[PDB]
Amino acid sequence: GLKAAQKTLFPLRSIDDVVRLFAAELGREEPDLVLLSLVLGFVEHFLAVNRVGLTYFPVADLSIIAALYARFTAQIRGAVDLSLYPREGGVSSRELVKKVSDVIWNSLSRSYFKDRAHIQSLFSFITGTKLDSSGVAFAVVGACQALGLRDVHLALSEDHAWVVFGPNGEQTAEVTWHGKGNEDRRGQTVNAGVAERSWLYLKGSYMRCDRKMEVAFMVCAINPSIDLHTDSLELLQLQQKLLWLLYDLGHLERYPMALGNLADLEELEPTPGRPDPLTLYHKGIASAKTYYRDEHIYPYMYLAGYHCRNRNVREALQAWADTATVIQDYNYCREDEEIYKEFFEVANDVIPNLLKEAASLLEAGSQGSALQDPECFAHLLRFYDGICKWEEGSPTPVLHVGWATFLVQSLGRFEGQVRQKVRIVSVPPVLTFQSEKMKGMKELLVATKINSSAIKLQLTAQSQVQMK
Ligand SMILES: CC1(C)CN=C(N2CCN(c3ncnc4sc(CC(F)(F)F)cc34)CC2)S1
């Protein structure tokens, strides 16, 4: 049950009342994940899913929240008999974690669309019997906290979630699915994935949450979307205020993606007296460097995206080059397709569109253009170098001829006299290439008219040209 002290702020009548509840729970020994997720899902439902009758804020009455809480706790406590899984040393067993996962998973509707909005919270789980992938992992952690299992924590990569538990928190267990059309591995460790150096498991440099970071996760998980064209202003404000609460308490210290998510919100609607979005993106990068060996991709892609939206071509290119410098030390594995898609869209859609506008502006007499800056050309080259190096040693190739056309076009946006100014230096602007593909392309990069076919051959390592 809920404790008397957890009840005293009800009813929640406003955004600020919800923030007060989070503040109170974050001040407790162990914030109550079940309570907090039910509250966020309740308000999200009445602000984004069904706004009929809304006049200001969907009042969250204690009776309503408490009844939701009771259905959750009844469902878990009834289904997981702890006497069957004795807790050796105040820590949980793999069998117990797998049982909790099975209870959540088996509760879900047989058939539904898993990419739907607003199926992330325990409100969704109770009222709709639907959860998204990471929502299952979160629910397992909330269930384990409800059961008294203090050792079970959420583990997060940039594209997946699982749990850590056991002696010293050193065990890992899959508790949910990943992607579409991959085989369930619930109950197994993440060691194979770590060992293969996939992006999905971040070479072991994934997040191991404490309770407060699990609160940060559910706050990041708020979805203000009403439809394709419309966001709930109330939910954006809530999410923003809650992320600032977390930030001020120190709970975003080790959470790069939350910092990027906050920065994005600040760009949309700045809060007076707070750091600028750029400051926040750089704090996210610093976090990744400090805590995660600089092995995360998204801190740089958040930064690049801000510069791209602001049509700052030079800084966007630098940040994408930095992105590629991270990815180069990974192997491209099966289940890494979301990061492949991201890189593909940057290379083959976003950069081309940025450079096309830059070319039109240059024709109109822009000064200090990225297209006349050899450092910008160098960034472009370093972006491609990291992608080519990523591919090296991977079980799965990255590049194909569909990339080559866009590379030739992008290179050609820079005049030969700009491109000539980059000095490509070997080990043992100045640029060093890590990838063998770019080293062999060096020779092609300064011609007034780039040799399109030779580029193509070098990028795809195509052996032959057409017979006839
Ligand atoms: C630069 C981008 C393409 C812009 N948005 C990005 N994301 C990255 C994913 N996301 C997250 N935010 C906070 N915590 C987490 S934890 C996670 C992984 C999984 F959902 F839990 F499995 C995704 C995610 C926020 C939205 S990266």
Coordinates of C-alpha atoms and ligand atoms in Angstrom, one line a residue:
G1 CA 0.0 0.0 0.0
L2 CA 0.6 3.8 -0.2
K3 CA 1.8 5.4 2.9
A4 CA 0.0 8.2 4.6
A5 CA 2.9 10.7 3.7
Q6 CA 2.5 9.8 0.0
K7 CA -1.2 10.7 0.1
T8 CA -1.1 14.2 1.5
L9 CA -0.7 16.2 -1.7
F10 CA -3.7 14.7 -3.4
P11 CA -5.7 15.8 -5.2
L12 CA -3.3 16.9 -7.9
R13 CA -5.0 19.9 -9.5
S14 CA -2.2 21.4 -11.7
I15 CA 1.1 20.8 -13.4
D16 CA 2.7 22.3 -10.3
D17 CA 1.0 19.9 -8.0
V18 CA 2.4 17.0 -10.0
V19 CA 5.9 18.6 -9.7
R20 CA 5.3 18.8 -5.9
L21 CA 4.6 15.1 -5.8
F22 CA 7.7 14.3 -7.7
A23 CA 9.7 16.5 -5.4
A24 CA 8.3 14.8 -2.4
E25 CA 9.0 11.3 -3.8
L26 CA 12.5 12.3 -4.9
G27 CA 13.1 13.4 -1.2
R28 CA 12.2 9.9 0.1
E29 CA 14.4 6.9 0.7
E30 CA 13.1 5.3 -2.5
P31 CA 10.8 7.2 -4.8
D32 CA 7.7 5.1 -5.6
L33 CA 8.0 4.3 -9.3
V34 CA 4.5 2.7 -9.5
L35 CA 2.9 5.8 -8.0
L36 CA 4.7 8.2 -10.2
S37 CA 4.2 6.3 -13.4
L38 CA 0.5 5.9 -12.8
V39 CA 0.2 9.6 -12.2
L40 CA 2.1 10.5 -15.3
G41 CA 0.1 8.1 -17.4
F42 CA -3.2 9.3 -16.0
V43 CA -2.5 13.0 -16.8
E44 CA -1.0 12.0 -20.2
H45 CA -4.1 10.1 -21.0
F46 CA -6.4 13.1 -20.2
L47 CA -4.1 15.7 -21.8
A48 CA -3.1 13.7 -25.0
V49 CA -5.2 10.7 -25.6
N50 CA -8.7 12.0 -24.7
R51 CA -9.1 15.7 -24.0
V52 CA -12.9 15.6 -23.9
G53 CA -14.2 17.8 -21.2
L54 CA -10.8 19.3 -20.4
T55 CA -11.0 22.8 -18.9
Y56 CA -7.6 23.3 -17.3
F57 CA -5.9 20.1 -15.8
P58 CA -7.3 16.6 -15.3
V59 CA -7.6 16.5 -11.5
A60 CA -5.9 13.3 -10.1
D61 CA -8.0 12.3 -7.1
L62 CA -6.5 10.0 -4.5
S63 CA -9.3 7.5 -4.8
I64 CA -8.6 7.1 -8.5
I65 CA -4.8 6.8 -8.2
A66 CA -5.0 4.6 -5.2
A67 CA -7.4 2.2 -7.0
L68 CA -5.0 2.0 -10.1
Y69 CA -2.1 1.4 -7.6
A70 CA -4.0 -1.4 -5.9
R71 CA -4.8 -3.1 -9.2
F72 CA -1.1 -3.1 -10.0
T73 CA 0.2 -4.3 -6.7
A74 CA -2.6 -7.0 -6.5
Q75 CA -1.7 -8.3 -9.9
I76 CA 2.1 -8.6 -9.0
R77 CA 1.8 -9.8 -5.5
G78 CA -0.8 -12.4 -6.4
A79 CA 1.3 -13.7 -9.3
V80 CA 4.8 -13.7 -7.9
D81 CA 5.1 -15.8 -4.7
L82 CA 8.5 -14.7 -3.2
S83 CA 8.7 -17.8 -0.9
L84 CA 9.5 -19.8 -4.0
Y85 CA 12.5 -17.6 -4.8
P86 CA 14.5 -17.1 -1.5
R87 CA 16.6 -13.9 -1.6
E88 CA 20.1 -15.1 -0.9
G89 CA 22.0 -12.0 0.7
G90 CA 19.3 -9.3 0.3
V91 CA 19.6 -9.8 -3.5
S92 CA 17.4 -11.2 -6.2
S93 CA 17.9 -14.3 -8.3
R94 CA 17.7 -14.7 -12.1
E95 CA 14.7 -17.0 -11.7
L96 CA 12.8 -14.3 -9.8
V97 CA 13.6 -11.6 -12.3
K98 CA 12.5 -13.9 -15.2
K99 CA 9.2 -14.6 -13.2
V100 CA 8.5 -10.9 -12.9
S101 CA 9.2 -10.4 -16.6
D102 CA 6.9 -13.3 -17.5
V103 CA 4.1 -11.9 -15.3
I104 CA 4.2 -8.5 -17.1
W105 CA 4.7 -10.0 -20.5
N106 CA 1.9 -12.6 -20.2
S107 CA -0.5 -9.8 -19.1
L108 CA -0.3 -7.9 -22.4
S109 CA -2.9 -7.9 -25.1
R110 CA -2.3 -10.7 -27.6
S111 CA -2.2 -8.3 -30.5
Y112 CA -1.5 -4.6 -30.7
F113 CA 0.7 -2.1 -32.5
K114 CA 3.9 -1.8 -30.3
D115 CA 5.0 1.6 -31.9
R116 CA 1.9 3.4 -30.7
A117 CA 2.2 6.6 -28.6
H118 CA 1.1 6.6 -25.0
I119 CA 1.7 2.9 -24.2
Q120 CA 4.7 3.5 -22.0
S121 CA 3.3 3.9 -18.5
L122 CA 1.8 1.7 -15.9
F123 CA -1.5 3.5 -16.6
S124 CA -1.4 2.0 -20.1
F125 CA -0.5 -1.4 -18.6
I126 CA -3.5 -1.4 -16.2
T127 CA -6.2 0.2 -18.3
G128 CA -5.2 -1.1 -21.8
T129 CA -3.0 -4.1 -21.1
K130 CA -0.5 -2.5 -23.5
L131 CA 3.2 -1.6 -23.2
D132 CA 5.9 -0.6 -25.6
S133 CA 9.3 -2.4 -25.4
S134 CA 11.0 -0.3 -22.9
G135 CA 7.7 0.1 -21.0
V136 CA 7.9 -3.6 -20.2
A137 CA 11.4 -3.2 -18.7
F138 CA 10.3 -0.2 -16.7
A139 CA 7.2 -2.2 -15.5
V140 CA 9.4 -5.1 -14.4
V141 CA 11.5 -2.7 -12.4
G142 CA 8.5 -1.1 -10.8
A143 CA 7.0 -4.5 -10.0
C144 CA 10.3 -5.5 -8.4
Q145 CA 10.3 -2.4 -6.3
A146 CA 6.7 -3.1 -5.2
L147 CA 7.9 -6.6 -4.2
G148 CA 10.8 -5.2 -2.1
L149 CA 13.6 -6.2 -4.5
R150 CA 15.9 -3.2 -3.9
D151 CA 18.6 -4.6 -6.1
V152 CA 16.7 -4.7 -9.4
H153 CA 17.4 -1.7 -11.6
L154 CA 16.8 -0.4 -15.1
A155 CA 19.7 -0.7 -17.6
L156 CA 19.5 1.5 -20.7
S157 CA 21.3 1.7 -23.9
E158 CA 20.5 4.2 -26.7
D159 CA 18.1 1.8 -28.3
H160 CA 17.2 -0.9 -25.7
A161 CA 16.4 -1.5 -22.0
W162 CA 17.0 -4.5 -19.6
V163 CA 17.7 -4.9 -15.9
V164 CA 20.7 -5.3 -13.6
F165 CA 20.4 -7.1 -10.3
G166 CA 22.1 -9.6 -7.9
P167 CA 25.3 -9.5 -6.0
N168 CA 26.9 -6.1 -6.3
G169 CA 24.3 -5.3 -9.0
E170 CA 26.6 -7.2 -11.4
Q171 CA 24.1 -9.5 -13.2
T172 CA 22.2 -8.5 -16.3
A173 CA 18.9 -9.9 -17.6
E174 CA 16.9 -9.3 -20.7
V175 CA 13.2 -8.6 -19.7
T176 CA 11.7 -7.3 -22.9
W177 CA 11.9 -7.6 -26.7
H178 CA 14.0 -5.5 -29.0
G179 CA 12.9 -4.4 -32.5
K180 CA 10.7 -6.3 -34.8
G181 CA 11.4 -9.8 -35.9
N182 CA 14.2 -10.6 -33.5
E183 CA 13.9 -13.7 -31.3
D184 CA 12.9 -13.2 -27.6
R185 CA 16.0 -13.5 -25.2
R186 CA 14.3 -12.8 -22.0
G187 CA 16.2 -14.1 -19.0
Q188 CA 19.6 -14.1 -20.7
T189 CA 22.5 -11.9 -20.0
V190 CA 23.7 -9.1 -22.4
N191 CA 27.3 -10.5 -22.5
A192 CA 27.2 -11.7 -26.1
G193 CA 26.1 -8.3 -27.2
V194 CA 28.7 -6.5 -25.2
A195 CA 31.4 -8.9 -26.5
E196 CA 30.4 -8.3 -30.1
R197 CA 30.9 -4.6 -29.7
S198 CA 27.5 -3.7 -31.1
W199 CA 26.0 -0.2 -30.7
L200 CA 23.0 -1.9 -29.1
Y201 CA 25.0 -2.7 -25.9
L202 CA 27.4 0.2 -26.1
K203 CA 30.5 -2.0 -25.5
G204 CA 29.2 -2.2 -21.8
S205 CA 29.1 1.5 -21.4
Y206 CA 25.3 1.5 -20.9
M207 CA 23.4 3.2 -18.2
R208 CA 22.9 1.4 -14.9
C209 CA 20.1 3.4 -13.2
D210 CA 19.6 4.1 -9.6
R211 CA 16.0 4.8 -8.5
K212 CA 16.3 8.5 -9.2
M213 CA 17.5 7.9 -12.8
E214 CA 14.5 5.5 -13.2
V215 CA 12.3 8.5 -12.3
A216 CA 14.2 10.5 -15.0
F217 CA 13.5 7.7 -17.5
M218 CA 9.7 7.9 -16.9
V219 CA 9.9 11.7 -17.2
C220 CA 11.8 11.4 -20.5
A221 CA 9.1 8.8 -21.5
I222 CA 6.3 11.4 -21.3
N223 CA 4.8 11.8 -24.8
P224 CA 3.2 15.2 -25.3
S225 CA 1.9 14.2 -28.8
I226 CA -1.7 14.6 -29.4
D227 CA -1.4 14.0 -33.1
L228 CA 1.1 14.5 -36.0
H229 CA 0.6 18.3 -36.0
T230 CA -0.2 19.0 -32.4
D231 CA 1.5 18.7 -29.0
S232 CA 0.0 19.2 -25.5
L233 CA 1.4 22.4 -24.2
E234 CA 0.5 21.2 -20.7
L235 CA 2.5 18.0 -21.1
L236 CA 5.5 19.8 -22.6
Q237 CA 5.5 22.2 -19.6
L238 CA 5.1 19.3 -17.2
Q239 CA 8.0 17.4 -18.8
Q240 CA 10.2 20.4 -18.8
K241 CA 9.5 21.3 -15.2
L242 CA 10.1 17.8 -14.1
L243 CA 13.4 17.6 -16.0
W244 CA 14.6 20.8 -14.4
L245 CA 13.6 19.4 -10.9
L246 CA 15.7 16.3 -11.7
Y247 CA 18.6 18.5 -13.1
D248 CA 18.7 20.6 -9.9
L249 CA 18.8 17.6 -7.7
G250 CA 21.7 16.1 -9.6
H251 CA 19.8 13.2 -11.2
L252 CA 20.6 14.0 -14.8
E253 CA 24.4 14.0 -14.1
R254 CA 24.8 10.6 -15.7
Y255 CA 21.9 10.8 -18.2
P256 CA 23.1 12.3 -21.6
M257 CA 19.8 11.7 -23.4
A258 CA 17.8 13.4 -20.7
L259 CA 20.0 16.4 -21.0
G260 CA 19.5 16.4 -24.8
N261 CA 15.8 16.0 -24.3
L262 CA 15.8 19.1 -22.0
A263 CA 17.9 21.1 -24.4
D264 CA 15.3 20.3 -27.1
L265 CA 12.5 21.5 -24.9
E266 CA 14.4 24.7 -24.0
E267 CA 14.9 25.4 -27.7
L268 CA 11.1 25.2 -28.2
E269 CA 10.2 27.3 -25.1
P270 CA 13.1 28.7 -23.1
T271 CA 12.7 28.9 -19.3
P272 CA 14.0 32.3 -18.0
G273 CA 17.2 32.1 -16.0
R274 CA 18.2 28.6 -17.2
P275 CA 21.1 27.5 -19.3
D276 CA 20.9 27.8 -23.1
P277 CA 20.2 24.7 -25.2
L278 CA 23.8 24.7 -26.5
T279 CA 25.1 24.6 -22.9
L280 CA 22.8 21.7 -22.2
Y281 CA 23.8 19.7 -25.3
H282 CA 27.5 20.2 -24.3
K283 CA 26.6 19.0 -20.8
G284 CA 25.2 15.9 -22.3
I285 CA 28.4 15.3 -24.3
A286 CA 30.5 16.0 -21.1
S287 CA 28.3 13.4 -19.3
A288 CA 28.9 10.8 -21.9
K289 CA 32.7 11.5 -21.8
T290 CA 32.8 11.4 -18.0
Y291 CA 30.7 8.4 -17.3
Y292 CA 30.4 6.4 -20.5
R293 CA 33.9 6.5 -22.0
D294 CA 32.6 8.8 -24.8
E295 CA 30.9 5.7 -26.3
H296 CA 27.5 7.2 -26.8
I297 CA 26.3 8.4 -30.3
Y298 CA 23.3 10.5 -29.5
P299 CA 25.0 13.3 -27.5
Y300 CA 26.6 14.5 -30.7
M301 CA 23.5 13.9 -32.9
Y302 CA 21.4 16.1 -30.5
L303 CA 23.9 18.9 -30.9
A304 CA 24.1 18.4 -34.7
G305 CA 20.4 18.5 -34.9
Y306 CA 20.2 21.8 -33.1
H307 CA 22.8 23.3 -35.4
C308 CA 21.0 21.9 -38.5
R309 CA 17.7 23.4 -37.4
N310 CA 19.4 26.7 -37.0
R311 CA 21.1 26.3 -40.5
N312 CA 24.5 26.4 -38.9
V313 CA 26.2 24.3 -41.4
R314 CA 29.7 24.5 -40.0
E315 CA 28.8 23.4 -36.5
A316 CA 26.3 20.8 -37.7
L317 CA 29.1 19.2 -39.8
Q318 CA 31.5 19.3 -36.9
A319 CA 29.0 17.6 -34.7
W320 CA 28.2 14.9 -37.2
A321 CA 32.0 14.3 -37.7
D322 CA 32.2 13.9 -33.9
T323 CA 29.3 11.5 -34.1
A324 CA 31.2 9.4 -36.7
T325 CA 34.3 9.5 -34.6
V326 CA 32.4 7.5 -31.9
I327 CA 30.7 5.1 -34.2
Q328 CA 34.0 4.1 -35.8
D329 CA 35.1 2.0 -32.8
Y330 CA 31.9 -0.2 -33.0
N331 CA 31.0 -3.2 -35.1
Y332 CA 27.8 -2.9 -37.1
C333 CA 25.7 -5.8 -35.9
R334 CA 22.3 -7.2 -36.4
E335 CA 20.0 -5.2 -34.2
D336 CA 21.9 -1.9 -34.8
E337 CA 19.6 -0.8 -37.6
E338 CA 18.2 2.3 -35.9
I339 CA 21.7 3.9 -35.8
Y340 CA 22.3 2.8 -39.4
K341 CA 19.1 4.6 -40.4
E342 CA 20.2 7.7 -38.6
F343 CA 23.5 7.9 -40.3
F344 CA 21.9 7.1 -43.7
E345 CA 19.5 10.0 -43.3
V346 CA 22.2 12.4 -42.3
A347 CA 24.5 11.4 -45.2
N348 CA 21.8 11.0 -47.9
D349 CA 19.1 13.5 -47.0
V350 CA 20.0 16.0 -44.3
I351 CA 23.6 17.0 -45.4
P352 CA 22.5 17.2 -49.1
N353 CA 19.7 19.5 -48.2
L354 CA 21.9 21.7 -46.0
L355 CA 24.5 22.0 -48.7
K356 CA 22.0 22.7 -51.5
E357 CA 20.7 25.7 -49.5
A358 CA 24.2 26.8 -48.7
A359 CA 25.0 26.7 -52.4
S360 CA 22.0 28.9 -53.2
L361 CA 23.0 31.3 -50.5
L362 CA 26.6 31.4 -51.8
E363 CA 25.3 32.2 -55.3
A364 CA 23.5 35.1 -53.6
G365 CA 26.8 36.4 -52.1
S366 CA 26.9 34.9 -48.6
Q367 CA 30.1 35.5 -46.8
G368 CA 31.8 33.1 -44.5
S369 CA 29.9 30.2 -46.1
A370 CA 30.7 26.7 -44.9
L371 CA 31.2 25.9 -48.6
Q372 CA 34.2 28.2 -48.7
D373 CA 35.6 26.9 -45.4
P374 CA 38.1 24.1 -45.8
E375 CA 37.6 23.1 -42.1
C376 CA 34.0 22.3 -43.2
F377 CA 35.1 20.2 -46.0
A378 CA 37.4 18.4 -43.5
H379 CA 34.4 17.8 -41.2
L380 CA 32.5 16.2 -44.1
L381 CA 35.5 14.0 -44.8
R382 CA 35.8 13.0 -41.2
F383 CA 32.1 12.0 -41.1
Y384 CA 32.6 9.7 -44.0
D385 CA 35.9 8.4 -42.5
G386 CA 34.2 7.3 -39.3
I387 CA 31.4 5.5 -41.2
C388 CA 34.0 3.7 -43.3
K389 CA 36.0 2.7 -40.2
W390 CA 32.8 1.5 -38.5
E391 CA 32.3 -0.9 -41.4
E392 CA 35.8 -2.4 -41.0
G393 CA 35.6 -5.6 -39.1
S394 CA 31.8 -5.6 -39.0
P395 CA 29.8 -8.7 -39.6
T396 CA 27.5 -6.7 -41.7
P397 CA 28.5 -4.1 -44.4
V398 CA 27.4 -0.4 -44.2
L399 CA 28.2 1.3 -47.5
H400 CA 26.7 0.6 -50.9
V401 CA 26.3 2.5 -54.2
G402 CA 23.2 4.2 -52.9
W403 CA 25.5 6.2 -50.6
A404 CA 28.1 6.9 -53.3
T405 CA 25.9 9.2 -55.4
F406 CA 25.3 11.5 -52.4
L407 CA 29.0 11.5 -51.4
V408 CA 29.9 12.7 -55.0
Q409 CA 27.3 15.4 -54.9
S410 CA 28.3 16.6 -51.4
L411 CA 32.0 16.7 -52.3
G412 CA 31.1 18.7 -55.4
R413 CA 29.4 21.4 -53.4
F414 CA 32.9 22.5 -52.4
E415 CA 34.9 24.2 -55.1
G416 CA 38.2 22.5 -55.9
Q417 CA 40.1 25.6 -54.5
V418 CA 38.5 25.0 -51.1
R419 CA 39.0 21.2 -51.2
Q420 CA 42.7 21.7 -52.1
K421 CA 43.3 23.5 -48.8
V422 CA 42.8 20.4 -46.6
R423 CA 46.1 18.6 -45.9
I424 CA 45.5 14.8 -45.5
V425 CA 48.3 13.6 -43.3
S426 CA 49.2 10.0 -42.6
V427 CA 50.1 8.3 -39.5
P428 CA 53.0 7.7 -38.9
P429 CA 43.3 22.3 -42.0
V430 CA 44.9 19.0 -41.4
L431 CA 43.0 15.7 -41.3
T432 CA 44.1 12.1 -40.6
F433 CA 42.0 9.2 -41.9
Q434 CA 41.4 6.1 -39.9
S435 CA 39.7 4.1 -42.6
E436 CA 41.3 2.4 -45.5
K437 CA 38.5 3.5 -47.8
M438 CA 39.1 7.2 -47.3
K439 CA 42.9 6.8 -47.4
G440 CA 42.5 5.4 -50.9
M441 CA 40.1 8.3 -51.9
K442 CA 42.6 10.9 -50.9
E443 CA 43.9 11.2 -54.4
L444 CA 40.4 12.0 -55.8
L445 CA 39.4 14.7 -53.4
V446 CA 41.1 17.8 -55.0
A447 CA 40.3 17.6 -58.7
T448 CA 38.3 20.5 -60.1
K449 CA 35.7 18.0 -61.4
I450 CA 35.6 15.0 -59.1
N451 CA 35.9 11.6 -60.8
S452 CA 32.5 10.3 -59.9
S453 CA 33.0 6.7 -61.0
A454 CA 36.4 6.4 -59.3
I455 CA 34.8 7.6 -56.0
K456 CA 32.0 5.1 -56.4
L457 CA 34.5 2.3 -56.9
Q458 CA 36.5 3.3 -53.8
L459 CA 33.5 3.8 -51.5
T460 CA 31.9 0.5 -52.3
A461 CA 35.1 -1.4 -53.1
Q462 CA 33.3 -2.5 -56.3
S463 CA 35.8 -4.6 -58.2
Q464 CA 34.6 -4.0 -61.8
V465 CA 33.0 -1.6 -64.3
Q466 CA 30.4 -2.6 -66.9
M467 CA 31.5 -5.1 -69.6
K468 CA 30.1 -3.4 -72.7
Ligands
LIG1 C1 19.3 12.8 -31.5 C2 18.1 11.9 -31.5 C3 17.8 11.2 -32.8 C4 16.9 12.8 -31.1 N1 16.1 12.0 -30.2 C5 16.7 11.0 -29.6 N2 16.2 10.1 -28.8 C6 17.0 9.0 -28.2 C7 16.1 8.0 -27.5 N3 15.5 8.8 -26.3 C8 15.7 8.4 -25.0 N4 15.6 9.3 -24.1 C9 15.8 9.0 -22.8 N5 16.1 7.8 -22.4 C10 16.1 6.8 -23.2 S1 16.4 5.2 -22.9 C11 16.2 4.7 -24.5 C12 16.3 3.3 -24.9 C13 15.1 2.4 -24.7 F1 14.0 3.1 -25.1 F2 14.8 2.5 -23.3 F3 15.1 1.3 -25.0 C14 15.9 5.8 -25.3 C15 15.9 7.0 -24.6 C16 15.1 10.2 -26.5 C17 14.9 10.5 -28.0 S2 18.3 10.7 -30.2

